[PDB]
Amino acid sequence: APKCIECHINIEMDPVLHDVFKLQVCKQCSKEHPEKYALLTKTECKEDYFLTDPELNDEDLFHRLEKPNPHSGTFARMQLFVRCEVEAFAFKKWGGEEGLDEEWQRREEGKAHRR
Amino acid sequence: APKCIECHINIEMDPVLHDVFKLQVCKQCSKEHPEKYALLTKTECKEDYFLTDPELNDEDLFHRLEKPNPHSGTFARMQLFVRCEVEAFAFKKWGGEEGLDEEWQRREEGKAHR
DNA sequence: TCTCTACGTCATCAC
DNA sequence: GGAGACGAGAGA
Ligand SMILES: [Zn+2]
Ligand SMILES: [Zn+2]
């Protein structure tokens, strides 16, 4: 049977990672490798990777899991993105980890000068 | 036999003003009173009256006439609004002609600095 | 007769 | 543990 791409052992994949994000990765390995597999909210994607609404809203560009908004079911649904997708796009947009670091720098300077 | 609300004479109303904007106004009167009946583009409404996309996009707030964009039919459709509607909303938003001209004054000062 | 949205940055409120 | 305010470029 098909084996998890991290451990090469487990045959039972994490239902979310597999069904939503198309990753043959078991639940244990996903918890051991959050640098790849962690789920990030839409707000975390904007804050951490400087991605915009038009990017994150593009269904052709990212897989996403939706859930009820934890603050209230009447508020806009929560949107969860897999770190490895988010990061891969962000590194392309910004010029790798380095460029992203540059952009983070450039916005902190922003607020200092803006009081 | 219903008469134009400007002249009280003509019974043939301007098709656009009547059908689209629901105004019983003849075409001659519409050209004689542009302060009421002139059609303004979406761009002109933003420029002249400081209305936003959310305001002008609101189907329940303004009547509007759409035409093909005159630059190219592949561009987004032109949208025309009637001055008397747009102005009445702008006057409410900004506090009469007084307050609108103030906003003008303000916005203009704002870019002077920049 | 031009129109829409990317670019901001973030408070607010969605209930 | 998400969806409008002030103002060039591509094409709704
Ligand atoms: Zn595994
Ligand atoms: Zn008349």
Identify, with chain letter, the residue nearest to nucleotide D12 (CA–C1').
B76
Report whether B55 contacts B89 (CB < 8 A).
yes
Is A23:A82 a contact under the CB 8 Å cutoff? yes
The reply to whether the CB atom of residue A71 sits less than 7 A from any atom in nucleic acid chain C is yes
Q: How far is the CA of B17 from the C1' of D4 (A)?
A: 32
Q: With a 7 Å cutoff on the CB, does A30 touch strand D?
A: no
Number of C-beta neighbours around residue B11 at 10 A: 10
Residue–nucleotide distance: A110 CA to C8 C1' (Å): 11
Given a contact cutoff of 8 angstroms between Cβ atoms, the answer to whether B4 and B11 are in contact is yes
Sheet containing strand A78-82, edge to edge, reads: A39-41, A78-82, A65-67
Q: Cα–chain-centroid distance for residue B33?
A: 13
3-state secondary structure A13-74: CCHHHHHCCCCCCCHHHHHHCHHHHCEEEHHHHHHHHCCCHHHHCCCCCCCCEEECCCCCCC
Q: Which token pair is A86?
A: 């988010």
Question: Please, what sign has the CA dihedral across residues A82, A86, A91, A97?
Answer: negative
Residues 17-56 of B with CB under 7 A from strand D: 50, 52-55
Which residue type is seen at B22? K
Helix (H), strand (E), coil (C) string for B50-111: CCCHHHHCCCCCCCCEEECCCCCCCCCCEEEEEHHHHHHHHHHHHCHHHHHHHHHHHHHHHH
Please name the helix (run of DSSP H) or strand (run of DSSP E) that holds residue B39, with its range, or none. Answer: strand B39-41
Method by which the coordinates were obtained = X-ray
Q: Resolution in A for the shown PDB structure?
A: 1.8
Give chain A residues 10-69 with Cβ within 7 A of strand C: 50, 52-54, 69
Query: Quick check: B82 CB within 7 A of strand C?
Result: no
Indicate the angle between helix axes A96-113 and A83-94, nearest 10 degrees: 80
Which residues lie below 8 Å from residue B44, measured CB to CB, with a gap of 6+?
A: none
Write out the two tokens for A32: 């051991």
Q: Is A26 annotated as a binding residue?
A: yes
Helices B83-94 + B96-113 axis angle, to 10: 80
Angstrom distance (rounded) from CA A73 to CA A68: 5
Amino acid at B67: K
Nucleotide nearest to A55 (CA to C1'): C6
Residue B107 Cβ under 7 A from any strand D atom? yes
Cβ contact B63:B21 at 8 Å: yes
